[PDB]
Subunit: 303 residues, 3 copies
């Protein structure tokens, strides 16, 4: 038993290589407030997915903080301890610490509540993120569906395969949603269910944003059949909620847009967009018997 | 013969590792209609490539469907069987299926031709994609040229190399275009020829969009010379045309832009951009003799 | 000694696999000119980082060439030797070479200095890049800081780890900046220091743009402790300055924006943005003892 079995279980036979992959992704679903005889911006795939595509990944804008009607000028910093001031002292004029968004004048200017903060020359008013809004603005996004289409290639063979298996069909695929118990190959996932299979609740993760991984895992013993090489799915949170132990901000990005009247009087407005980012983290290795390399590997065992 | 030859052919000697890579890409070429004394938007690299860069990849906008002059409001759905209606029945008021772009009122509203469809509260009018325009709008894109610049690094060595080989020169590189028979190292490819070397015709693939892979393949026996480690090129289609057997849509994306008068009356306009996406799918393994690890590997053979 | 030691040093024991990774990046810092009682656009993270995110990578806009107030029409080509003309000859009417941005009329039109160039139908005036401005416009970017947050996963284990090590804390992390001699684990790098650790000077590399790699390298003997698996950092230039020996342009991209009056009279303006691109090139392999696969590998040694 021993000698044959150990090589046969271990697979020193089968020649193996790691997988070359390509991906495309779409989100589908709509969100709204009010109805007929009324107006409120209805949300679709052309709004909430920006940027429209990324390599192996996509974003969903779950919650938004709005910075409005800016010009460049003079205003107070936000009340945070590292430059809350009784009077000017460490806030050196003509200097700007790496946390900041503007340059000191040397003045501890008055500000409401806590009675003063250090001044900055900056875009004004400053960005305030002291209270990330709750509930998360795009609360309806839990129900949206992500389509993950993936093609795998093995350079050690003429082989390739598409994650939409060769027996899935139109009238099913227009309404299937993935479930590991009943539909192990439908390429469509429901965003709330991506996060729930990772053990987190989308109700909360949507507030401050985060990063989410669809681990499309490929592993094939290519000896059997092309009909029998198959994908398996798993889901992982990739940020972490270790606050005060710290991690810098929960995942977000801070794009802006900018405008003028005909007379040229500039403004920016800035969106601190909090969201969940979905990374389609494909990985695989696959093996095929192949006698030539096997004879060497098993040859060490044959001695 | 046997014992030495099998190890010598197989390369249990040579120590090997898989490649760390970076890429940059530009497209060059122009497209037009009309001439002097006339006006029609002339197309260049600043228009047709959007988004301007992506990781290991780029897009070319071959064909465009235009959704115009929108507001949020009340309008019919497109005539497709899953909600063509004789009268209201399954189209439940206050509900929206995952195919859709708006919410039911419960009314099977009249619409022209096929006499009715279910209503949605939505962006209106709805997106129509029942007839992807032919010939493809940017027909001239077949002649455009993509420059692929790639640098490879092997962490098991101090080694790196640039795919623009160390003997290519200015006056050649300003006009070379790749051909596997005569110019195996020119970094410039012609888009129509990328697709033709994959066996497809750009004349048709430009209509409904798709995904295309430049497999820049590196494989070196580093023992020989740095002058003799070299890239090899190959081209693969990565989407598939298995319609009715289905694949969801052919590759496209659906960005939009949005506007107001000074009085604030909003619009969007939405581009369903169909195109070819080019993925610069670099992969390599390379090997160098190295006596220390060889002595172990060949040691199993020496027994 | 020999038999045990060679297997024990070489690590045919320990089972090993290559790493699955995710990344997020932010830049922080500000740049300015003039002060109070004066106006000049102040620069922050919402301006200079565009595009707002990319997979494993980010851009910093170090230097900008401006193409202004365009319409489509008739104008001369830039004075470059491959179509500087004494009179019309090779510049065939209705043809456009792959270097160009417009189509020949067959006329060698007059132009100032060198007295003529071939005409193009084009966007006009043409893009001029004959003198990349010096010093680089965003000179202050040397002082900006990039935060690199990286999570690693090993599919051969339940294992994962975050590059912000489990003993880094808030009040340090709000002001640490990386240095291989004193702070080997702070996730924040200073852009000028990224380039200086690669041996180049940011003072010059900022002029014509280029590509820069933060090689976050993971290598763990997982036997020891999760507390003792640790990242190591290194920095590499990935473009090259081999001019005249050539490389096509130094790294840049050429986005544009476009506008109309209410009457619809179109313009574009085009930014040839030169910058440094930062690629967070994570790679790792890690090994853990594991007796089952070891017994096979060492079994060849035991014979
Ligand atoms: N320009 C803008 C502007 C603006 O300038 O008004 C406002 C924006 N939000 C927004 C948020 C709430 C809104 N109302 C509202 C909601 C609840 C109760 C009562 C009233 C309304 C609106 O009433 O329209 C508009 C955005 C952008 C973007 O540009 C933008 C770009 C990309 C993604 C998202 C956005 C975005 O959210
Ligand atoms: N805003 C717009 C607008 C608009 O608002 O008019 C129109 C657009 N197309 C378009 C198409 C055809 C056009 N004429 C035409 C062609 C044949 C025969 C007769 C007449 C004309 C035009 O005559 O100018 C314009 C686009 C955008 C984008 O924003 C845009 C953004 C990114 C990529 C592409 C586009 C785009 O194609
Ligand atoms: N639209 C624009 C426009 C415009 O239309 O005026 C001008 C732009 N530059 C710019 C450069 C210099 C400026 N002054 C100045 C500097 C030194 C001495 C004296 C005067 C001023 C300004 O005075 O404001 C403005 C940009 C954009 C973008 O759209 C843009 C988009 C993304 C990144 C960068 C840019 C950008 O640099
Ligand atoms: C496509 O055909 C295959 C045939 O094997 C179906 O396979 C499923 O395989 C998993 C194990 O990998 C089983 O747990 C399931 O029970 C199988 N399905 C069924 C219906 O028994 C696959 O399901 C087929 N595709 C569809 C859409 O059913
Ligand atoms: C750069 O130098 C090399 C020297 O080997 C040229 O190599 C070509 O190599 C392939 C095989 O890999 C041969 O089929 C070609 O015939 C070789 N070229 C020639 C001209 O014979 C390479 O072509 C050189 N670069 C250029 C631009 O010619
Ligand atoms: C977190 O704890 C570790 C404990 O090992 C600190 O480890 C540093 O490890 C390197 C070698 O990898 C040594 O050269 C350093 O001297 C160690 N640091 C010190 C302070 O001695 C690590 O530095 C700790 N984190 C912080 C922020 O200090
Ligand atoms: C900006 O805010 C002011 C009031 O603070 C308002 O008058 C102005 O119209 C706003 N700008 C725009 C473009 O809405
Ligand atoms: C939108 O269409 C209407 C006619 O349906 C037209 O009057 C209006 O000017 C259009 N809007 C714009 C901004 O062109
Ligand atoms: C474009 O330039 C002309 C002068 O050449 C100027 O009159 C016009 O106002 C400029 N356009 C804009 C929108 O500034």
């Amino acid at each position: 038993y021993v000698i044959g079995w150990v090589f046969v279980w271990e697979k020193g036979y089968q020649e193996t290589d790691s997988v070359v992959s390509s991906v495309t992704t779409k989100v589908k679903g709509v969100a709204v407030t009010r109805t007929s005889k009324l107006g409120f911006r209805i949300w679709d795939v052309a709004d909430y997915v920006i940027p429209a595509q990324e390599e192996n990944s996509l974003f969903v804008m779950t919650n938004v903080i709005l910075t409005m009607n800016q010009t460049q000028g003079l205003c107070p910093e936000i009340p945070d301890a590292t430059t809350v001031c009784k009077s000017d002292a460490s806030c050196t004029a003509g200097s700007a610490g790496t946390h900041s968004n503007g340059v000191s004048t040397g003045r501890c200017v008055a500000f409401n509540g806590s009675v003063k903060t250090c001044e900055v020359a900056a875009w004004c008013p400053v960005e305030d993120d002291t209270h990330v809004p709750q509930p998360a603005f795009l609360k309806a996004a839990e129900r949206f569906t992500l389509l993950v289409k993936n093609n795998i290639w093995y350079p050690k063979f003429n082989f390739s395969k598409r994650n939409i298996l060769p027996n899935i069909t139109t009238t099913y695929l227009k309404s299937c949603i993935y479930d590991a118990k009943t539909d192990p190959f439908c390429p469509i996932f429901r965003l709330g269910k991506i996060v729930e299979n990772a053990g987190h609740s989308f109700q909360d993760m949507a507030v401050e944003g985060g990063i989410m991984g669809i681990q499309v895992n490929w592993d094939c013993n290519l000896d059997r059949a092309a009909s029998l090489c198959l994908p398996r799915y798993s889901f992982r949170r990739l940020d972490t909620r270790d606050v005060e132990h710290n991690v810098s901000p929960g995942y977000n990005f801070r794009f802006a847009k900018y405008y003028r009247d005909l007379a040229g009087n500039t403004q920016r407005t800035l969106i601190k967009a909090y969201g969940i980012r979905f990374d389609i983290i494909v990985f695989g290795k696959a093996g095929k018997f192949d006698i030539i390399p096997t004879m060497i590997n098993i040859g060490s065992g044959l001695a």
